[PDB]
Amino acid sequence: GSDLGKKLLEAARAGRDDEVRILMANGADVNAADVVGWTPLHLAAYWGHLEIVEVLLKNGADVNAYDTLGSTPLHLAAHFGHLEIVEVLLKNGADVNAKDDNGITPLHLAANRGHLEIVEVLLKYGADVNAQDKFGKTAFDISINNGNEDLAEILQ
């Protein structure tokens, strides 16, 4: 990578909007990835930094960038209950049916943590409700196992 690529990964994670702003002006690599394959957008999505997610996507960040285990920023945002970021990523063309190495989708992760608003947004953008993981489990199979009767009704 590069020196500024490291500072952007740190700034994006930390939630330092002003530092990200200056780094985007100076031309810090938006596609800079750490050893596990996490871009600044991965980190911003994980820690729930909405403005940085939007600024990175404006500066040509790969919305469908995946780590060394095949997980995308939408996977992270959907799993940790960041509703606004999930909407932004999906508007900027995030693959709603993105499968990691385990066959897990953003819908599976949202269903597992009982993020009802996010599950509805994924279904609104055409989330495959019948999509199975490596163990042949759907988002509905997770809801009945978790005992989330509200979520199970949405997924029908």
């Binding site: 750490d34 050893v35 596990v36 996490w38 163990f135």
Partner: protein, 48 residues
């Protein structure tokens, strides 16, 4: 500061379906990757 760590989930249903005990799984992972202190031996008159 927080660092990236490799989270692995054992599927309890799949383990029970294949007839694989969780003790054997967690021992295999723990012993191999982490290392396991089994017992003591005597090297030139010193317990080690």
């Amino acid at each position: 500061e927080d660092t990236p760590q490799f989270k692995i989930d054992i599927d309890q249903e799949k383990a029970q379906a294949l007839g694989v005990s969780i003790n054997d799984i967690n021992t295999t992972l723990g012993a191999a990757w982490g290392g396991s202190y089994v017992n003591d031996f005597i090297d030139r008159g010193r317990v080690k």
